[PDB]
Amino acid sequence: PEIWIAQELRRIGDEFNAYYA
Amino acid sequence: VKKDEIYYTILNIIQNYFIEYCTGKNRNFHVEDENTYIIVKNMCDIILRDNIVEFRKDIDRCSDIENEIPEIVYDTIHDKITWGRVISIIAFGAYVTKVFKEKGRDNVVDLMPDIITESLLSRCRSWLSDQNCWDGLK
């Protein structure tokens, strides 16, 4: 629930970060 | 917790992006730092465009979401802080704000910027300060 959200913000944050320096 | 120049350096940008994202009105000329705002504004608009559907599912899966924002932020960057995670929080924060706005009553909308800025700084202040706040994001 609130933990699933947190983990998806980490996937999104980590992928976003890798593709842009 | 403490409202310093750092607290308001971040809040100014989050507050105006939420405003711009909810009303669709340009805020490039109300923000203190125009160059940062454009960068962060675009970063969040990319995340939203690519993940608005997932946000819509996770949000309908979670009742009582206003009082769960600090926990989501905590559980996103407790093991490590990165700008990618910080931006994802702001973008998802923006979506929630719009969602509570279209649900129709604004008293929460007035608080979302402070709520995430508080949650963000409760764990990342030194990390943000050691980069001169948004300078590290450029």
Numbering used by the authors:
A (entry chain B): 54 to 74
B (entry chain A): 5 to 142
What are the paper's exact sentences on this?
These findings establish CNP058 as a viral Bcl-2 protein with a broad pro-apoptotic Bcl-2 binding profile that is a potent inhibitor of apoptosis.
We then sought to understand the structural basis of CNP058 interaction with the BH3 domain of pro-death Bcl-2 by determining the structure of CNP058 in complex with the Bim BH3 domain. The Bim BH3 domain is bound in the canonical hydrophobic ligand binding groove formed by α-helices 2–5. Detailed inspection of the CNP058-Bim BH3 domain complex interface showed that Bim residues Ile58, Leu62, Ile65 and Phe69 extend into four hydrophobic pockets on the CNP058 binding groove. In addition, two salt bridges are found at the interface: Asp83CNP058-Arg63Bim and the highly conserved Arg89CNP058-Asp67Bim, which is a hallmark of pro-survival Bcl-2:BH3 domain interactions.
